[PDB]
Amino acid sequence: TVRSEKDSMGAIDVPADKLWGAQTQRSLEHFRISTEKMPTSLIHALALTKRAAAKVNEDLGLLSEEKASAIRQAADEVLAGQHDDEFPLAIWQTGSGTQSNMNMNEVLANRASELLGGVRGMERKVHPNDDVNKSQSSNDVFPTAMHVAALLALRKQLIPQLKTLTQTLNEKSRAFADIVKIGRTHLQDATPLTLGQEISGWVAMLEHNLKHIEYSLPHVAELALGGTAVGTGLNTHPEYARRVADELAVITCAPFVTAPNKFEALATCDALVQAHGALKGLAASLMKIANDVRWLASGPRCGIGEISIPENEPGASIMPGKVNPTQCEALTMLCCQVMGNDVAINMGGASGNFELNVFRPMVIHNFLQSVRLLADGMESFNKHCAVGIEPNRERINQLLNESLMLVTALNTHIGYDKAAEIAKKAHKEGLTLKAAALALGYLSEAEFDSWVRPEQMVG
Amino acid sequence: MNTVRSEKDSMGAIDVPADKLWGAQTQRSLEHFRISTEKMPTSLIHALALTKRAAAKVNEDLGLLSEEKASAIRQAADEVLAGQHDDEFPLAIWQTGSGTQSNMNMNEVLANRASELLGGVRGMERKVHPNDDVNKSQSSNDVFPTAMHVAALLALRKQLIPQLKTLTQTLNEKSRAFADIVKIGRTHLQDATPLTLGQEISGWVAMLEHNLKHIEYSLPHVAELALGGTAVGTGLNTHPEYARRVADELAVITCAPFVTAPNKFEALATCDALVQAHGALKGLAASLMKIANDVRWLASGPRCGIGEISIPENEPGASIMPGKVNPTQCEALTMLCCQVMGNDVAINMGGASGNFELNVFRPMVIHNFLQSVRLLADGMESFNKHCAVGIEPNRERINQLLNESLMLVTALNTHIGYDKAAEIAKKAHKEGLTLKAAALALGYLSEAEFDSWVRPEQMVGS
Amino acid sequence: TVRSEKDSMGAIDVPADKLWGAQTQRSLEHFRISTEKMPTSLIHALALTKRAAAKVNEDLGLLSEEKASAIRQAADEVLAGQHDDEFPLAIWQTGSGTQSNMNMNEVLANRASELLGGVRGMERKVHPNDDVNKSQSSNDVFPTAMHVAALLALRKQLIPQLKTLTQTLNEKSRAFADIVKIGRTHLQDATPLTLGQEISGWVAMLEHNLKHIEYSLPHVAELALGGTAVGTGLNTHPEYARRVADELAVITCAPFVTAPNKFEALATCDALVQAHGALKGLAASLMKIANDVRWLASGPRCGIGEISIPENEPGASIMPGKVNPTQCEALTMLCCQVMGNDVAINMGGASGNFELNVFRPMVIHNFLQSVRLLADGMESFNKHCAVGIEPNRERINQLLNESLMLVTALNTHIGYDKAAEIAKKAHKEGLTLKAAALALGYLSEAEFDSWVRPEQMVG
Amino acid sequence: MNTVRSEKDSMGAIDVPADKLWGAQTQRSLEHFRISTEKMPTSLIHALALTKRAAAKVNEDLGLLSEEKASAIRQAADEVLAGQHDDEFPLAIWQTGSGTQSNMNMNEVLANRASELLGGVRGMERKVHPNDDVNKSQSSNDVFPTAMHVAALLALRKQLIPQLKTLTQTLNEKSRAFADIVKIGRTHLQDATPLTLGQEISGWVAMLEHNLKHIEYSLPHVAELALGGTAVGTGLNTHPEYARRVADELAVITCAPFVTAPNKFEALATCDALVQAHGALKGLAASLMKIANDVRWLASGPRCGIGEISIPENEPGASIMPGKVNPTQCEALTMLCCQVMGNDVAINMGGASGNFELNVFRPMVIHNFLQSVRLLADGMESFNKHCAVGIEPNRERINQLLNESLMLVTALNTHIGYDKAAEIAKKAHKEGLTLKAAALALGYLSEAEFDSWVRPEQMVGS
């Protein structure tokens, strides 16, 4: 049931049906904190980092072709989802990510040994440190995997979902471009704008956010690998850093480059602090959009009720028309989460010392969570709410013609002071605008219905 | 004034304005920390003066400081407390992290002024000395945390708690006045089963009562004072009774229950009492945000929103959109509640960042803490007098919304059965009818039966 | 492989080997956001809430004994860990927690049906809404489960671990009460204190934190159950609210009470905002303690090096004595997490509207995570670091006698000005205190070794 | 002054101080929002004056405002910009959430002053009118966000970016000066393989260069101006060229690349540009915290810490502990970096909280944003001139730590083999010896061989 594996501290029992080794087993004894583990995206990024290092070590004559090929095949198995239960370590581990680095070194070594016709354990043919970790430190591997995971998740999950939601809202803005509704400022009745114009604000927000996120990508694409322990690259080949960044760029099809300054790359999480700044901006924009949708849909009788949204959940038959805006609630909740995650990231990023920032597992846990939340949240909100937004045209028109600020249209005809008098009149008593205007003899009713035209008041 | 006076410290001489009472170390800090515009708040300056006044009294009691000097120092401190020397404290929040520079600012101003009170002069011929006399038995390391806690506890007791109690009382009066006004409930922003306006306001009242208790629970820790720990917490070379005596003297002159900190190492190395007390303040900010939002949403309109209540109209804006009045008290309150949340993060970072024997994030921690107390106290005071005391129901609008909603339909269940009641609600919703119109259209009851059976006052409990 | 279950929206396929129903299945379609699910503590609290409601409904004659007993037995199976895979829903769901409430209603109904000799599915003998949810709303059930989970986790996990760590540090403070070391303020050489005194500061911090956490418990013990949809308790028995709080108190052995104001209980998360305030205070204290430990242990040659800590991880044989303070790193990282979690909670708690706060899954996700992190982190730091803190007595004494601030001891003998002169002398040149004092003739060397006694300088 | 002048708005008459230039709406705000002490910063007041000056010019160009009135309004605005009217702006941050009250403050002051410039008087007989003239073509809803962006962009361009560039240059000079000084590395706070002091500082330089680029990427969005959107974003009843013309005029008078916002609905409904730009500022705060901490830790001592570098000694403290000087510039910087983090949270909450056509958390957002810019700009300026320009290595201490560490042992591997080198390191660690002493004790090499083989200058790359 168990196997005895060894490190420099001695022997330790490891489950026979697992591929990790002594160091992973010790971490399981020493870091039994909560339930958060490395996410799949990070495990995959670590496997890609080892795959690239193995290829470059082979190219430089430092690692045999048979070992380099077996390591790459084992890494491909991780990427293919064959070893998810081989990565049991907590986020709340050593702050450099050493334990997860060793987790990957041990799993890949034991598995590559089997691929070469050998066995897992201390008789293995491939060695976690001398082979899988060759030319590397935990110090430069872990920030490399952080940036690989972050850049790929932004490119493959978040940005596509952001574009998809933007396109849906752009279509809605065009479809509702002629529907005049009442504006609200301070929650109070204002002047008209079209529903398409209001939605066009949401679209412009999402377009701006995309640009801000795109501006953060070049820094995230810079990789620490090759800085080794403290940034000098001592005892590495002078071409290794460029070569491994090039290999990661080839195998991921993403524009990874070696970090021009390895001291900044090891001592900080600055690229992720900055990139997460753009994500909390997106969270603030999505919060506003989600709130507008649920407030506009509120009712069906005692709120605003200007739009309808899809009803996705069942309800009591005695309560027809209570449609809780549950996609909006999920989205607003995750936006709060992103704001909190930003604070955790900022504290970790502010807290480097000398040659190494050792808040890294926590920083990447928060960062990748925010990406998942925003990407999946935008997908969910798009599919289950935004694509189905529809106007309640009768309710929109009823509210539009209730606003006393339609009196704006009378300025050019009878002057601001008499328009302000009609509005103050209708407000002080319980009268409409036209009832107030006719009681003052400032115009005829035909003059009113010809001059007060909301469709002419939207620019 | 252009003319200068030469003041000296152990590093040499520096020119200070001739018309000012500070000395060399104040001038060095003023010149070396030209960072933004935030200065020590008056509450903290007063707390520093109180600290020096108490130390002078105790040093005299113990025979360490002459009556003549101790009395002059206390007289100078009383001038500061009376508001006669606000312009003598020019230093930034963004100074040394222990607040040494503001400690020295008080030492220098009080020494120069006490010298004048003894018939002497300000400057290097002074009769009273900032270090040997005004700072006797003290370090910046125990003085500044003491002033922080004195300022914080007095602000909580004298400003925040009374304003919280006043706002709670007003809302309790409104809850009682509106106890019989049934309105539509809202959950998820959707129409829901009814409750009274008084019941809804009673929730706000209960929130403020709970917040008061949480704040009260934080006060004993803030009442613990570092004074007597001196440089590292050991109290080296101070009188064994000094720490208790100075806490007792501060308790006397402030009428507040200050005590000496039982562990001076915790008192110097952390801002933990303020981190915890600010936790209660951010709780209050979250409650006040919710109350303020309920008020402005319920008041929204006057025609295109909810409009269930009216609030006082206090100012117009620009002439564009004539007669439009906004819930500006609610907005000021929601804005300051956001500020308190951000201040909590800054405080938490400073509080988490002590090293060894001293936390040196102190000016920033106390700047944020006292700001949050001002914002919450003054904001509650303003919201109360300019909005809450004048909340009124719009009874016709409340009834219109309630009676035109679908949420009174369950009152029909006992009379006609669930199935017919649900059929009525479904028809009303699909066809845009009131429940009464749908029920009459189906022939399931008479108008008189509907009016007799559908009683909102029977659907809210007691 | 599948079963057809129904709700008011129609039929939907549910895995035959699962116990949930139509509403849980729909939630799995509509809320596919990230990976965070309800934690076990919350699932168990929900099961306890249903168990108590079933007992009270039976006592009041509203639910048959056979159904109430079967529901309680099913709930006990959940509490016994027999149904962990029956709760698949995301945190990022409806903001009231309706979906997880229905998840529990459906699992308990289908299972209780089997316990009565029936089947799962639409032919079941126990019904999720009419039976398992009787007298309840999602609106009052979910905040009840939040408070049950929070109070029990504070009482059973966090507070015991806090007391355990405090006791360890108290023992260390006593053991090192006579070891004089150099104080540091602003990172600079100060006057002496004992190592026991310095550790006594950590102890006092943890004692204060315990009191603050204890002060938060009475509010968390107040339960919303019985407020139903909006707080009025419409269509419930007048004794139900008190009875169900009493039953929860009996079955948990914790002092639960019914909330005196159900409107505050439904419309806010205030008790948890306040309780989390105490937890972020503990995080700030633990951060400081952990930082003191790792800085005091830094080295072994180019830092402070005043204490040693256990070495739990292997290292390269060529690098003996590099002992990374990995427990300190895990602890400081989770303290940053708690600070971020506090911001997320504060935003959710500030964001209630009218009768209901609908940020609840996110609030409780963060709150229970902070409890796990702090409780498990204190356990880990205690077992794997704090219990093994030891002084490096030679290094402590070497640094103690290096500080020029030992010149303080000369004030009472030769006066402050000449003491300040000796210190300014030793600082300006490259001399010790005694070399400077002898070169000035201010004292003999016997006078120096008799007057400068650090053990006499600690109070 | 006790004497009053009666000023009027649409709600009635109110007394204002006779010696002040503001009007009825300023007085109502002053009296109704007595909340704490934070007021509009001078940068924002100036940005409001610039906005009014540009609107007056464009309104004149379009034939909507007489030359005589437009010129007098611009003259009054120039007086504000010249610092002649700071005491005329008494309003709190904690006012209406749109900033209407400060919009009206500028309208009233400029109208009353422009009236005087035309030979008229202040008050209700004035010749120039706050609403019809100074606010022509405008709403508070587009004026306040415009002033926010004008103040923010100018502060970033004129204060923050130049100070960031200056500090970067200083640290680059230090990196070059110390390029040959090998020191011990530290990872996890533990002794690690060596690098040069110049390499370590080059990390700080690279951090500041990256931060500059991130800040620069945020500027185009802040340059977009809401002016022309009026009340809800439609620009109802304004000239079709007004929005472009006023952005062009602001670009001319500020020499900054302002443009009209392509979507006025986004510009009114959000503070998104400032939420994003502040994200870059909190990134800079995290970098500066790390740099400041490296400096104070490396300078720590002078005898019981690290002590690898020396920094300027700028002030003493109190006489207790004589001659002890603290890294006070580092402390001010770390404190303000904490402040920026908290300010980010307050900004994010305000930015997330818009509703419908207008975000009404604006005074609080801009208060925090401009504070962070002042803190970071002035803090970098202060840290540079009072600390960074004077960083110096303690060469003997650096060499002592390096040579007495265990981390040079790998230099022996190629000469005696890994196994003997590891044996030497293990013996040195267990017995408290230097590597040289352990190697000699084992008889594995000579002292001359050790000195020849163990070359730190060969262990740092290039």
Tab-separated table of N, CA and C in Angstrom, chain D residues 322-400:
chain	number	residue	atom	x	y	z
D	322	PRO	N	20.814	58.368	23.020
D	322	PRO	CA	21.495	59.484	22.344
D	322	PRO	C	22.180	59.043	21.057
D	323	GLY	N	21.975	59.824	19.998
D	323	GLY	CA	22.610	59.567	18.724
D	323	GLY	C	21.915	58.553	17.842
D	324	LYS	N	20.777	58.008	18.268
D	324	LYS	CA	20.048	57.032	17.467
D	324	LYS	C	19.277	57.762	16.374
D	325	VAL	N	19.551	57.413	15.118
D	325	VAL	CA	18.916	58.039	13.963
D	325	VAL	C	18.175	56.964	13.186
D	326	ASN	N	16.951	57.263	12.804
D	326	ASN	CA	16.059	56.301	12.200
D	326	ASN	C	15.826	56.597	10.720
D	327	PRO	N	15.485	55.560	9.923
D	327	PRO	CA	15.251	55.708	8.468
D	327	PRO	C	13.881	56.317	8.198
D	328	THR	N	13.763	57.600	8.544
D	328	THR	CA	12.453	58.236	8.591
D	328	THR	C	11.879	58.490	7.203
D	329	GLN	N	12.729	58.720	6.195
D	329	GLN	CA	12.201	58.841	4.838
D	329	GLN	C	11.568	57.536	4.383
D	330	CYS	N	12.206	56.405	4.704
D	330	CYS	CA	11.647	55.099	4.366
D	330	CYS	C	10.295	54.901	5.045
D	331	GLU	N	10.182	55.332	6.303
D	331	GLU	CA	8.937	55.164	7.045
D	331	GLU	C	7.811	56.016	6.467
D	332	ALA	N	8.090	57.282	6.146
D	332	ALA	CA	7.058	58.106	5.520
D	332	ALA	C	6.572	57.462	4.230
D	333	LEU	N	7.496	56.894	3.455
D	333	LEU	CA	7.134	56.295	2.178
D	333	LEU	C	6.305	55.027	2.378
D	334	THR	N	6.729	54.140	3.289
D	334	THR	CA	5.929	52.945	3.534
D	334	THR	C	4.543	53.300	4.053
D	335	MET	N	4.439	54.357	4.865
D	335	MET	CA	3.126	54.732	5.380
D	335	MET	C	2.221	55.216	4.260
D	336	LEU	N	2.745	56.052	3.363
D	336	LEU	CA	1.885	56.562	2.302
D	336	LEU	C	1.537	55.472	1.296
D	337	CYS	N	2.386	54.453	1.165
D	337	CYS	CA	2.044	53.341	0.288
D	337	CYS	C	0.857	52.568	0.848
D	338	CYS	N	0.800	52.408	2.174
D	338	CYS	CA	-0.385	51.816	2.786
D	338	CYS	C	-1.610	52.674	2.499
D	339	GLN	N	-1.460	53.999	2.594
D	339	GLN	CA	-2.575	54.897	2.319
D	339	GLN	C	-3.098	54.701	0.902
D	340	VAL	N	-2.196	54.556	-0.072
D	340	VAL	CA	-2.632	54.379	-1.454
D	340	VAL	C	-3.445	53.100	-1.602
D	341	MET	N	-3.028	52.023	-0.927
D	341	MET	CA	-3.798	50.778	-0.976
D	341	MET	C	-5.215	50.980	-0.452
D	342	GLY	N	-5.353	51.652	0.691
D	342	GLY	CA	-6.686	51.905	1.208
D	342	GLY	C	-7.491	52.817	0.299
D	343	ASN	N	-6.841	53.850	-0.253
D	343	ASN	CA	-7.526	54.742	-1.182
D	343	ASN	C	-8.048	53.973	-2.385
D	344	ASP	N	-7.320	52.935	-2.809
D	344	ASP	CA	-7.774	52.159	-3.956
D	344	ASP	C	-9.110	51.487	-3.671
D	345	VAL	N	-9.276	50.950	-2.460
D	345	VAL	CA	-10.533	50.302	-2.084
D	345	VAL	C	-11.681	51.308	-2.091
D	346	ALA	N	-11.465	52.484	-1.497
D	346	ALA	CA	-12.523	53.489	-1.493
D	346	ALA	C	-12.909	53.882	-2.915
D	347	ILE	N	-11.913	54.052	-3.787
D	347	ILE	CA	-12.175	54.391	-5.182
D	347	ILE	C	-12.938	53.270	-5.873
D	348	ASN	N	-12.538	52.022	-5.629
D	348	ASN	CA	-13.194	50.898	-6.289
D	348	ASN	C	-14.649	50.795	-5.874
D	349	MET	N	-14.935	51.020	-4.593
D	349	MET	CA	-16.321	50.996	-4.143
D	349	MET	C	-17.124	52.115	-4.795
D	350	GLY	N	-16.580	53.336	-4.804
D	350	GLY	CA	-17.282	54.420	-5.477
D	350	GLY	C	-17.474	54.146	-6.956
D	351	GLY	N	-16.427	53.655	-7.618
D	351	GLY	CA	-16.515	53.392	-9.043
D	351	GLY	C	-17.497	52.295	-9.404
D	352	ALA	N	-17.667	51.310	-8.521
D	352	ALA	CA	-18.585	50.202	-8.749
D	352	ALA	C	-20.036	50.585	-8.508
D	353	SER	N	-20.302	51.795	-8.006
D	353	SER	CA	-21.600	52.137	-7.435
D	353	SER	C	-22.383	53.171	-8.246
D	354	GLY	N	-22.082	53.345	-9.527
D	354	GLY	CA	-22.932	54.182	-10.349
D	354	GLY	C	-24.316	53.581	-10.526
D	355	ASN	N	-25.302	54.435	-10.805
D	355	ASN	CA	-26.635	53.967	-11.167
D	355	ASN	C	-27.125	54.754	-12.370
D	356	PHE	N	-27.599	54.044	-13.397
D	356	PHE	CA	-28.270	54.680	-14.540
D	356	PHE	C	-27.340	55.720	-15.150
D	357	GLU	N	-27.746	56.978	-15.248
D	357	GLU	CA	-27.031	57.923	-16.085
D	357	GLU	C	-25.897	58.648	-15.372
D	358	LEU	N	-25.733	58.472	-14.058
D	358	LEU	CA	-24.735	59.261	-13.340
D	358	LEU	C	-24.130	58.487	-12.175
D	359	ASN	N	-22.805	58.508	-12.075
D	359	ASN	CA	-22.119	58.064	-10.867
D	359	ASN	C	-22.077	59.238	-9.889
D	360	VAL	N	-22.625	59.036	-8.690
D	360	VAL	CA	-22.688	60.084	-7.676
D	360	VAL	C	-21.864	59.710	-6.448
D	361	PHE	N	-20.657	59.201	-6.692
D	361	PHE	CA	-19.647	59.015	-5.656
D	361	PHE	C	-18.415	59.866	-5.949
D	362	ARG	N	-18.600	60.949	-6.711
D	362	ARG	CA	-17.476	61.603	-7.380
D	362	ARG	C	-16.558	62.392	-6.453
D	363	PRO	N	-17.049	63.260	-5.550
D	363	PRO	CA	-16.108	63.953	-4.649
D	363	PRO	C	-15.189	62.997	-3.904
D	364	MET	N	-15.726	61.872	-3.435
D	364	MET	CA	-14.908	60.918	-2.692
D	364	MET	C	-13.870	60.259	-3.597
D	365	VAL	N	-14.275	59.847	-4.802
D	365	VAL	CA	-13.331	59.243	-5.745
D	365	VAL	C	-12.171	60.193	-6.029
D	366	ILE	N	-12.480	61.454	-6.357
D	366	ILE	CA	-11.415	62.393	-6.732
D	366	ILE	C	-10.581	62.820	-5.520
D	367	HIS	N	-11.198	62.935	-4.340
D	367	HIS	CA	-10.434	63.177	-3.117
D	367	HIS	C	-9.348	62.120	-2.935
D	368	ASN	N	-9.727	60.843	-3.014
D	368	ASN	CA	-8.751	59.766	-2.876
D	368	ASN	C	-7.732	59.781	-4.007
D	369	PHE	N	-8.198	59.927	-5.252
D	369	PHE	CA	-7.281	59.854	-6.389
D	369	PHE	C	-6.212	60.940	-6.310
D	370	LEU	N	-6.627	62.195	-6.104
D	370	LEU	CA	-5.643	63.269	-6.073
D	370	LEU	C	-4.752	63.155	-4.846
D	371	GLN	N	-5.284	62.632	-3.736
D	371	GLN	CA	-4.429	62.379	-2.586
D	371	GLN	C	-3.335	61.382	-2.931
D	372	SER	N	-3.701	60.269	-3.566
D	372	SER	CA	-2.685	59.286	-3.923
D	372	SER	C	-1.624	59.890	-4.831
D	373	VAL	N	-2.027	60.759	-5.760
D	373	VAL	CA	-1.039	61.376	-6.642
D	373	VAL	C	-0.103	62.293	-5.853
D	374	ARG	N	-0.649	63.122	-4.954
D	374	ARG	CA	0.212	63.956	-4.109
D	374	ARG	C	1.176	63.105	-3.291
D	375	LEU	N	0.659	62.056	-2.650
D	375	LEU	CA	1.488	61.230	-1.776
D	375	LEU	C	2.624	60.579	-2.551
D	376	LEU	N	2.310	59.996	-3.707
D	376	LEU	CA	3.326	59.284	-4.466
D	376	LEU	C	4.327	60.251	-5.083
D	377	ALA	N	3.846	61.350	-5.679
D	377	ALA	CA	4.755	62.337	-6.259
D	377	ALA	C	5.648	62.952	-5.187
D	378	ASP	N	5.037	63.521	-4.133
D	378	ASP	CA	5.826	64.202	-3.105
D	378	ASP	C	6.678	63.208	-2.328
D	379	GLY	N	6.166	61.992	-2.132
D	379	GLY	CA	6.931	60.980	-1.416
D	379	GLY	C	8.158	60.533	-2.187
D	380	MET	N	8.004	60.283	-3.491
D	380	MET	CA	9.172	60.006	-4.324
D	380	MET	C	10.144	61.176	-4.335
D	381	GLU	N	9.627	62.403	-4.412
D	381	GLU	CA	10.507	63.569	-4.389
D	381	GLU	C	11.295	63.624	-3.086
D	382	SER	N	10.618	63.363	-1.964
D	382	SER	CA	11.254	63.467	-0.658
D	382	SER	C	12.256	62.337	-0.462
D	383	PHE	N	11.833	61.099	-0.748
D	383	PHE	CA	12.725	59.957	-0.602
D	383	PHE	C	13.966	60.122	-1.465
D	384	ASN	N	13.799	60.666	-2.670
D	384	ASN	CA	14.946	60.862	-3.547
D	384	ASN	C	15.941	61.840	-2.944
D	385	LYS	N	15.471	63.040	-2.603
D	385	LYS	CA	16.415	64.081	-2.222
D	385	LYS	C	16.951	63.895	-0.814
D	386	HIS	N	16.206	63.214	0.060
D	386	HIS	CA	16.598	63.091	1.452
D	386	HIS	C	17.098	61.708	1.807
D	387	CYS	N	17.135	60.785	0.846
D	387	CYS	CA	17.666	59.470	1.170
D	387	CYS	C	18.402	58.860	-0.029
D	388	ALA	N	17.700	58.674	-1.156
D	388	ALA	CA	18.244	57.880	-2.259
D	388	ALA	C	19.540	58.454	-2.824
D	389	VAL	N	19.632	59.784	-2.980
D	389	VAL	CA	20.835	60.369	-3.579
D	389	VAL	C	22.072	60.126	-2.731
D	390	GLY	N	21.892	59.799	-1.451
D	390	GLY	CA	22.991	59.577	-0.540
D	390	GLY	C	23.229	58.153	-0.095
D	391	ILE	N	22.615	57.158	-0.740
D	391	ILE	CA	22.884	55.771	-0.376
D	391	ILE	C	24.341	55.450	-0.662
D	392	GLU	N	25.014	54.826	0.309
D	392	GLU	CA	26.406	54.441	0.137
D	392	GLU	C	26.637	53.041	0.691
D	393	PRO	N	27.499	52.252	0.053
D	393	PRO	CA	27.840	50.938	0.605
D	393	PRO	C	28.759	51.066	1.807
D	394	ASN	N	28.591	50.143	2.751
D	394	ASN	CA	29.562	49.932	3.822
D	394	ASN	C	30.388	48.743	3.345
D	395	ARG	N	31.485	49.045	2.639
D	395	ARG	CA	32.215	48.011	1.909
D	395	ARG	C	32.797	46.957	2.843
D	396	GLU	N	33.335	47.376	3.991
D	396	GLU	CA	33.910	46.399	4.911
D	396	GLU	C	32.841	45.473	5.483
D	397	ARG	N	31.678	46.021	5.837
D	397	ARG	CA	30.605	45.198	6.383
D	397	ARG	C	30.060	44.240	5.332
D	398	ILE	N	29.878	44.727	4.104
D	398	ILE	CA	29.439	43.864	3.011
D	398	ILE	C	30.393	42.687	2.858
D	399	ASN	N	31.701	42.969	2.883
D	399	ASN	CA	32.688	41.904	2.719
D	399	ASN	C	32.712	40.972	3.922
D	400	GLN	N	32.554	41.519	5.129
D	400	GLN	CA	32.511	40.674	6.318
D	400	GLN	C	31.371	39.669	6.227
